[PDB]
C-alpha cells in the first residue's frame, strides 16, 4: 500500500507570506498521464474541502492563490498570498488502484 508522509507536520506562516506543504508517497501515483493525488482543507468543526485535483488543477470554489504542483513521487502545495482564513489542517490523498490513504496533516497556524 502507498504510504504518504507530510512535511512539515506543523507550519507557522505569517499573513502575506508563502506557505509550503510537501507530500511524499511510497510509490508512484501516475497511471495514465494523470497524477492521482488531491489536496484537501479541513477547518475545525467543518467538513474537508477539496482544493487541488490531479495535483495541478484547482476546484470550483478555490481561489487562484492556492496552487498545487508535483508529478511522480514528490508533490507540493503552495499558498500565496496566505490569508487568515487558511488556518486549517491540509491533507494529501492518493487515488491509486485499490487502497486510498490520506497524508499526515499539516497544521498551518497564524
Amino acid at each position: 500500500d502507498i504510504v504518504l508522509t507530510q512535511s512539515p507536520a506543523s507550519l507557522a506562516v505569517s499573513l502575506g507570506q508563502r506557505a509550503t506543504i510537501s507530500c511524499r508517497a511510497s510509490e508512484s501515483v501516475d497511471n495514465y498521464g494523470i497524477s492521482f493525488l488531491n489536496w484537501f482543507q479541513q477547518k475545525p468543526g467543518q467538513p474537508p474541502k477539496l482544493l487541488i485535483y490531479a495535483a495541478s488543477n484547482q476546484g470550483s470554489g478555490v481561489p487562484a492563490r492556492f496552487s498545487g504542483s508535483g508529478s511522480g513521487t514528490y508533490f507540493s502545495l503552495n499558498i500565496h498570498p496566505m490569508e487568515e482564513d487558511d488556518t486549517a489542517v491540509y491533507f494529501c490523498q492518493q487515488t491509486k488502484g485499490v487502497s486510498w490513504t490520506f497524508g499526515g496533516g499539516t497544521k498551518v497556524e497564524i
Binding site: Y32, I34, L37, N38, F40, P48, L50, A54, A55, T95
Partner: peptide, 21 residues
C-alpha cells in the same frame, strides 16, 4: 464519519463534494 463522492478519472477521483459527518 464523512461521506464524499469521487470524481472521474482525469480528475483524479477527486472528492469535490462532501457530506456533513
Amino acid at each position: 464519519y464523512f461521506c464524499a463522492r469521487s470524481a472521474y478519472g482525469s480528475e483524479g477521483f477527486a472528492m469535490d463534494y462532501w457530506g456533513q459527518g
